[PDB]
Structure 1
Amino acid sequence: LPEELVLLEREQIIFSSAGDVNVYDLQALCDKVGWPRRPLTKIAASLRNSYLVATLHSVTRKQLIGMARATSDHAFNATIWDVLVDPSYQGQGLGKALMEKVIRTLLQRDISNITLFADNKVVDFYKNLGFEADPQGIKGMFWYPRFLEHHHHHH
């Protein structure tokens, strides 16, 4: 699996794990899925400290249409925090295609333990991709979590 590769040419859809995400493009994408804005420098900080930043662009000249972002200890563990596809391109299997490339990239980097936190409405989506909730009764826990109006997975 290389770093950049055409997923389909309907317009091209390009996958990359290079991590070149412009914070203003990302802000606009998060706007489309209803996220409250946050300091651009803290978004930039979260990006440079994310081991895997994977993008989908529409190339007709580039437009960011999807992103997956994971932290990792670069050795054993990764957590995929955000998976976002532009609502204009949802229903086309792009979230699934992005996730397959994300998983393959992490395995190629020899990351063995790949995790995520799925809101109730995408649990089945990730189950179909091979994710398993609560293996052996292990629980994902949060320290005093706030109520979340917004979701981190859009496909």
Structure 2
Amino acid sequence: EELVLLERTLEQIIFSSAGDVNVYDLQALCDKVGWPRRPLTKIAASLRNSYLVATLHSVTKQLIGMARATSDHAFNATIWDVLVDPSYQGQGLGKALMEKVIRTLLQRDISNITLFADNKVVDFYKNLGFEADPQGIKGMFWYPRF
């Protein structure tokens, strides 16, 4: 359940669905992306209670991409926090990470694969096959403060 995606020269990219993601490495990444720090114990609790945590590492190991899902292990899953290191965006890695994520969940027989997308990346997911408000279904938040 580990893979080597590509090899370049002057490093590789390794997808994993294991879960060895060090909350300090992840923190480092979220910073690069400008996210605000969250209690590392609470981050560690979210990775532990996530049905699927998928990783891209850049060996020469180095966290350069992550996605994770919750799921009821049976019917539904929801994809959260898929992020890719700025100096690796625009290379196909977000696509590859997502493709394998979906594939992993299909292989575990999750039939309903959902997520919530910012307006600026909705197109990135429609290309991957995601379909917004199908049949007038709406995705709702309790008193969001964004």
Q: TM-score range by the shorter chain?
A: over 0.9
Distance (whole Å) between structure 1 residues aligned to residue 124 and residue 4 of structure 2 = 23
Q: CA deviation at 1:89?
A: 0.5
After superposition, give the CA deviation of every residue in 1:37-82 in whole Å (9 maximum; x if it has no partner): 010000000000000000000010x000000011000000000011
Moved >6 Å (runs of 4+) = none
Q: CA deviation at 1:99?
A: 0.3
Q: CA deviation at 1:100?
A: 0.3
Q: What is the TM-score normalised by the length of structure 1?
A: 0.92
Q: CA deviation at 1:83?
A: 0.5
Higher relative contact order structure (alpha carbons within 8 Å, sequence separation ≥ 6): 1
Distance (whole Å) between structure 2 residues aligned to residue 38 and residue 121 of structure 1 = 23
Aligned-pair identity in percent equals: 100
Higher-strand-fraction structure = 2
Q: CA deviation at 1:145?
A: 0.4
Task: Structure 2: state its 5+ residue gaps.
Answer: none
After superposition, give the CA deviation of every residue in 1:128-151 in whole Å (9 maximum; x if it has no partner): 11000000000000000011xxxx
Q: What is the TM-score normalised by the length of structure 2?
A: 0.98
Task: Structure 1: state its 5+ residue gaps.
Answer: 148-155
Q: CA deviation at 1:5?
A: 0.4
Distance (whole Å) between structure 2 residues aligned to residue 75 and residue 145 of structure 1 = 28
Q: CA deviation at 1:34?
A: 0.6
- Number of positions where the alignment pairs a residue of Structure 1 with one of Structure 2: 144
Distance (whole Å) between structure 2 residues aligned to residue 107 and residue 99 of structure 1 = 12
After superposition, give the CA deviation of every residue in 1:86-145 in whole Å (9 maximum; x if it has no partner): 001011010001000000000000000000001111111110110000000000000000
